[PDB]
């Protein structure tokens, strides 16, 4: 589909670069690591560039040996269920079918994954193994970053041993540099000043299909209601009008949205830095050759950049703090910031507890290290991009073809840093009033789907907000019964804390149950009694019937929600069911369930 760029090898020859770092990223982490590695090259006398594999034809890897002392690095994150990130899907398909000989190619791979997921770092492992099979030579061990511990630390550790290994192999030997230049614009046509749009200038005001990540559709918020009964937390239900957008979706899909940071937080960053956020400007790449002309849409004001384009709420990465150290006039403070990039020792410890664990955002660090007064433009060049957030569409297109429903809990907690942290997208979404309140969005097709046959039994497990996609599933299955179709059993295993505090969609669910769309509404109230009652407890309670639906009914199992503990607990209970009724040994029940996943009968929509 995408028109590829001309050979990245030729571009390297023209720009005197010998190292190219590709990033397979869904949410920007692999992208940032790749930019860092690429920039590191310069410190070791080499010259590098980072690149998006989706924009090039990786077959040109076979020409890479034409450049002396050349090397290619892949920072690859895994996504979905042991799948490539969207921007790496093309590269992935090529690796599987090509037969190209990579003799002479030198490579290294750093994988980004999460040990709590079924297939840990599947993509990274695949690319690393495949390049070798194709004939290339590994110049450094595969990196296995784990987002469940601390991914940043894994990268640091890996990066520390990578460069020395690269220098050693090519016999090469080992000062703050800016990637962009500030150009302040005096009196310009507002008609050419970005105000928050993501792609084509003025694309938010002048909407034109097709709509997607690059060209989001600004959907009107037709409804935004509180879902939970109690006041402990704030759970919400929003309905986005996608009429006339020509966007198509199915239950199980995700809808992404581009939020705006908290304006007040943006005002304080400017204030504490003594900068005018209303200045119109551009940050242009000092490398007039790169396709990346700006770190974000330019020209624009800092206010706009800090509001729609930059992430100012997550814990700054170590390289960011490292580059800011130069701006801290107080020695001890400059020392602390500088040591955040350590692979061990008290500097690493301080980074892990004072920045990560305490969840200190950029503003917090500015306040707690008062001698740190970085210029606003450099900071903007260092902050990562503000990512879209995904939400499991909570409606069926068979019933609501022109509306996309969202079920989310607002994020707001007391951090160890002493302040209250707000979730960017949920705080933004929560404040949208139906009145128009517009939400930039797009739909990403998923593989979470109802069975094709209406008669196939369905087993849905989704505690808390994990119920989201199932509301769509249920509406659709109820729709099929109404349409005169023959629908098999539909069981919902939901869980909340108290039926009078956070029982989401209580009225809607009662209805579906009553009318027969829901064969069974099994709800685990985790806090109404002294002991915990979870969804897996209900599954174990119904083990005999569930086995029957699975073994003889060809039922489809779906799990949605917390991927950290809930998914595994639920999965283990399924192991116990299969093990007991097969019967078989645990190890065989585990195989059994894993095959259900390959056969498309055990799907997951788990979050982290
Ligand atoms: C595929 C997919 C589907 C999803 N579906 C939904 C869904 O349907 N409904 C839903 O509600 N969510 C779902 N999400 C999560 C959603 O995408 C957002 O991550 C979530 O809404 C938070 O976004 P935010 O901008 O409000 O918070 P952010 O500003 O992005 O902050 C998120 C971070 O805050 C930190 N944090 C949260 N609570 C605490 C705490 N109490 N203590 C310390 N740190 C904490 C964590 O690091 C968390 O990653 C989904 C995520 C994925 C990936
Ligand atoms: N954006 C998100 O929605 C998002 C993102 C990432 C992770 N998560 C995680 O998903 C989980 C649920 O969050 P939520 O806000 O949707 O609702 P929640 O109220 O935090 O949890 C929903 C229900 O799940 C129960 N539960 C807790 N641990 C369980 C487990 N080990 N196995 C089965 N059930 C368990 C909870 O009981 P108790 O609370 O009484 O133990 C509660 O009854 C949390 O761990 C949350 O951090 C959510
Ligand atoms: C919906 C979703 C699915 C994921 N699936 C996997 C997976 O199968 N295996 C794995 O190792 N990590 C998985 N992860 C974790 C990511 O690989 C990890 O968080 C990575 O740092 C994200 O990088 P990015 O920001 O560069 O895309 C998943 C994360 C999300 C949000």
UniProtKB/Swiss-Prot annotation:
CDD domains assigned: CYPOR (cd06204)
GO molecular function: cytochrome-b5 reductase activity, acting on NAD(P)H; electron transfer activity; enzyme binding; flavin adenine dinucleotide binding; FMN binding; hydrolase activity; iron-cytochrome-c reductase activity; NADP binding
Record carries keyword Transmembrane: yes
One Pfam family this sequence matches: Flavodoxin_1
Cellular component annotations (GO), alphabetically ordered: cytosol; endoplasmic reticulum membrane; intracellular membrane-bounded organelle
Cellular location(s): Endoplasmic reticulum membrane
HAMAP family: NCPR
Protein name: NADPH--cytochrome P450 reductase
Organism for this UniProt entry: Rattus norvegicus
